Every structure is written in structure tokens, then in C-alpha cells.
Ligand binder design. Sequence first.
Ligand SMILES: CO[C@H]1O[C@H](CO)[C@@H](O)[C@H](O)[C@@H]1O
Ligand SMILES: CO[C@H]1O[C@H](CO)[C@@H](O)[C@H](O)[C@@H]1O
Ligand SMILES: CO[C@H]1O[C@H](CO)[C@@H](O)[C@H](O)[C@@H]1O
Ligand SMILES: CO[C@H]1O[C@H](CO)[C@@H](O)[C@H](O)[C@@H]1O
Lengths: 17, 16, 15, 14, 133, 133, 133, 133
Amino acid sequence: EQSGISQTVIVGPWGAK
Amino acid sequence: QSGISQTVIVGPWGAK
Amino acid sequence: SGISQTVIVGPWGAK
Amino acid sequence: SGISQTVIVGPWGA
Amino acid sequence: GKAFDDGAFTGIREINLSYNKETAIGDFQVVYDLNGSPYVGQNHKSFITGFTPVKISLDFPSEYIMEVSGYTGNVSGYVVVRSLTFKTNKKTYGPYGVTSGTPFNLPIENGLIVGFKGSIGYWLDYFSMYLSL
Amino acid sequence: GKAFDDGAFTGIREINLSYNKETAIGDFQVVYDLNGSPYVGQNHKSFITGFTPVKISLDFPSEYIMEVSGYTGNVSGYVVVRSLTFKTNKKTYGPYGVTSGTPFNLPIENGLIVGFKGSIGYWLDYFSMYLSL
Amino acid sequence: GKAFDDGAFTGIREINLSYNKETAIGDFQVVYDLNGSPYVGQNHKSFITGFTPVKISLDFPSEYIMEVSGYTGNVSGYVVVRSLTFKTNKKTYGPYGVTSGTPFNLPIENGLIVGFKGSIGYWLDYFSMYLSL
Amino acid sequence: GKAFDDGAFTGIREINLSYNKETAIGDFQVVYDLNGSPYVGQNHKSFITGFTPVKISLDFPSEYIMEVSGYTGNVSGYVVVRSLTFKTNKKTYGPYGVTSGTPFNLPIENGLIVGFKGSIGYWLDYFSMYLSL
Ligand SMILES: CO[C@H]1O[C@H](CO)[C@@H](O)[C@H](O)[C@@H]1O
Ligand SMILES: CO[C@H]1O[C@H](CO)[C@@H](O)[C@H](O)[C@@H]1O
Ligand SMILES: CO[C@H]1O[C@H](CO)[C@@H](O)[C@H](O)[C@@H]1O
Ligand SMILES: CO[C@H]1O[C@H](CO)[C@@H](O)[C@H](O)[C@@H]1O
């Protein structure tokens, strides 16, 4: 599974879960 | 550029 | 996964 | 700086 | 509310949000940097009016955000983002909103914020940030 | 007291810390994954003793931390991390310590914590995390 | 010639280049993916015309380039890129151009090409690639 | 041959390899940097002897590799790595081994080589490189 879509680190979410 | 690899760092928490 | 990934180029040589 | 970076390989050619 | 996801970019040039001192954050929009060209992100609008607009124009690329902090809490029964403060290497923008409730802070020691995603109904319900080197 | 910086690794196999219900977090040590093998991190110890040790053994690589949170507050004149909580995709470990003071939380939507840095005197004064894909 | 730098994106959806069986690569344009939506890149054109245009449409995001290779050589006294071949996890596109001169190849075991830069005069003189997870 | 995969690190401090001009590259071993500490990688040994030892001691972190190039070709019926050359921002080390066969080159504009993996029998059969910011 490698996708052609580049990944990025994401932090959160803050607020309603 | 440095010859040292870098990475994302978050914080600090606990006072600056 | 729980394993950090890294870009890898190659291989150069056989296969 | 405020500009994101990325690994770059090359160049190939002249 | 309506979920949004700007995606990741090369950096941040300007942030345009709106807030109400008695409620929470409303509109949220960002002009990112996409490999040297300003990228006008879509405006993510609150379903209601009544907010005060704020324009945060950074001196990109020398100026960049080093910490994002704020407060979450209930408004009309909804857990929302009530306040936001953006701190860069040059100055502090905010607090915008209502500084009460549960605080939160994301200090960045190394790296950059390069995108926002979240959800907005009457207010900003929640948000997340893309981080990169 | 004494600053520490483990730097970055490939993942996390185990966290070993200690705390005291009268005060705050004391020792902190991590067994990291380094390219498929365990790497035993430096043990960062409090200058004092009398703490309760706890071991957090993660089922690496399937289990990984998705959120870190806790409390910071005054302890005999120092503002330190009084409590820590680690939530993985599998379960929650903690709270360890005393849940009093102002809270903080780092939820991760994509990526991994791959290292820890900070400072410990009598207690854990502060800490930062390395994040990576 | 004219130097170009597209910068980095989130992936590649299409490559449109042109070549001439007697010389080398001429035009080069990429339709990138930018956060799930197409981003039409700048068309980097030769100072001359008469080339054969080619379109490489990738089944993004399932299909992606795994190896780029080709040839550099002399054309009227200039060392330029005479041929290119893009191999994805699904097929091979090319060779386009004259497969003569010195070969080069960039196999990628893990990661993605997410941008291009280089320079084009009468022909593609040289190029580099942005790589990312 | 016997496969090897050192994995990824913080940087490179020294490379210890061996070669034979009649044949190809033989031994390959690397002292990497692991968060400020030298990490002695395992010595991936050729099944046979008679090689000429080469030590490339980099002035880390000031000095770092900017390009790795070489040649692949047949020796006793096996397609292997016959030669290697390591160019840094300060010096060029090599070529080690005969420069015949199919050339290859990996120039790096931005980023660092941070690991090596491959396979060694009588000679280096193939290898890949970990790249990172
Ligand atoms: C009052 O309800 C609206 O506003 C809240 C708060 O923003 C949203 O959570 C909700 O889905 C609706 O859009
Ligand atoms: C009592 O003082 C010690 O402990 C505190 C709390 O850890 C540190 O901040 C301080 O520098 C000393 O090391
Ligand atoms: C004929 O000269 C032009 O074309 C060559 C090859 O493309 C370039 O190198 C050069 O600078 C000019 O632009
Ligand atoms: C003599 O054979 C050995 O050496 C060659 C060249 O390295 C390998 O390809 C092969 O599998 C064995 O390990």
C-alpha cells in the first residue's frame, strides 16, 4: 500500500471531538 | 545545509 | 503504522 | 524560514 | 457544521478570521504560500452574522507562526473554539474571542504550520493543523 | 535541573516514568524502536527519589500513541508537569501524577511521536516531542 | 535557456512533454495533484517548435511513478536530456526521444516525486525532482 | 548474496569500504551519527578476500555527501556494483573500483543520505539509500 498521495503530519483536532 | 537530519518538534509544555 | 518512514532511492546493481 | 522544504535530487543533464 | 480541509502548502502569508467577544470564533480563511505564489484559500464562513473581522498579514517568509493557542468551551450547547492567539517570531496576534474555558496550546520548536482543516457551523467547532519542515 | 534531548528514532516500544501523588512526574525513560530493533534510551532521573515507577509497554508496531496530555502546576515554587496521560490507538495509560493545574493536550491525527526532549530537576519541568511520518 | 522551478505538490496526475526523434526533449508540463484536486503546472516550452507532443495520464492516486530514467547527450554542441522514460507501478511510458548518450535512472523504493525544476532552451538542458513521503 | 539494511539515522560520519580493480566493490560498513553520537554500523562483509580497504572520514556535520555515483556491470557472470564515488561539499572520494559498465548517479540538491541497505555476496550486488531532510 503506497498511495500516489503525499503525506503530512497533522496535529489536532482542538474543539468538539 | 547542515549534515544533521532535522525533524518537527512541538512543545514545550510545562513552562517555557 | 507505528513505524516512522523514510524516502528511499534505488536499488542500483542487480535484480 | 517560513518556507517549507523538500528533498531534491538532481540535476540530470548538462 | 460544514467540514473543511485546505490541505498542505509551503507556508502562510495571511489569516482572515472573525470572532465575537461573547461567543466564539466564526469565519476562518487563509492565504497560503504555494511555491512562491499567494494561494487564496476558500473562505470558511459561519452560518450566522454578528462577528468582528480580523486580518493577520504576516511578513512572509521572515515572519512565521511559532505558537497557536486558544480556548474551547460550550456555546449554546456546542463545544467550540472560543478564542485564538497566533504568536510569530515577530509578534503576537490575539487573543481573539473569549479567553475562558479549557485552554490549549501548540508551541512549535521546529517546523512550520502549512495548512488548516476543521469544521464551522455557527462557530468554529474544531480545527487541526498540518505541520512540516 | 538537567536538560535532556533523546533526539529522533523510528518509533516507541516502551515508556518508563515515575511520579508521586504529593508532587509531580519524576523520572522519564523511553525504549525507542530504531530501525526494527529496541534502542534503550537514557534514563532521565530526578535529583530526588521516593517516586512510584510505572512501565508502559506498547505492542509495537501495531499500537502507537495518538494523544499525550496532562497537567502543569506549581510544586513548592516550581511550575512542572504534575501529570501525564498517554492514549494509544489501543488504550489509555494514566493519568499518572496529580491532575491539578492547567491542562495541555497534543492529539495527533497523522504522524508519530519519535523522540522526547526536556528538563528534569526534582521533577519534570517541561518537555517537547519530535513528530514525524 | 530559461530556468524553471515548479516547487512541491502532493503528487502527479499527468505529464505532457514533447520530443523530436532527431534531437531531444522539448516541452515539459505537469498536471500535479494539490491536496486532492488537479493543479495545472506552468508549461515549460522550448524556444523552438516542431516537436511531437505526448500525454501521460496517470490513474492517480493508485498509479504513481516508481522510476524515471533516460539519456543525456550532445545535440548541436549542448549537453541536454535526449530521452525520458517514466515507469509507474502499472506501466512504462516511453522512451520518448533519442535513447543515445549517457544513461541515468532514478528508481524509488519508498516515496514520491512531487515536483520538477530545471531549464529549457532549444531543449531540456537539465532537470531535478522533489521527493517526499 | 546476503542482504543488509542498516536503516535510517541522523547523518553519516565515516564510510569503510573495500574494492578490487579487477572486480567490484567488496566490504561496506558505515559509522552513522545517531542524535549526536557515533553509531557503528555492522560490517557487511564480502564472502571472499583480497580487497583494498578505503576509509572515508567526513568532517561531520560540516561535511556531508552531495552525490553518490558509480558503475554497475558483470563480474564472473553476476550483475554487481563495480565502482563507487562519493562527492561531498568539500572533497570527492573515489572512484573506488573500475569505472566500466552502466553508469549511475544520485546528485542531491537538498537533503541528506541517512542510511544504506543492499546485498553483498562476493561483491556488492545492489544497494539503495535512505534520504531525508
Ligand atoms: C447551532 O448549530 C449549528 O452550529 C453549531 C456550532 O458551530 C454546529 O456544531 C452545528 O452542526 C450547526 O451548524
Ligand atoms: C528544587 O529545584 C530543583 O528542581 C526543580 C524542579 O524540577 C528544578 O527546576 C530546579 O532547577 C532544581 O533542579
Ligand atoms: C541553442 O542555444 C539555446 O538552447 C540550448 C539547449 O537547450 C541552451 O543551453 C542555450 O542556453 C540556449 O537557450
Ligand atoms: C559467487 O556468488 C556469490 O556472489 C555473487 C556476487 O556478489 C552473488 O550474486 C551470489 O548470490 C553469491 O552471493
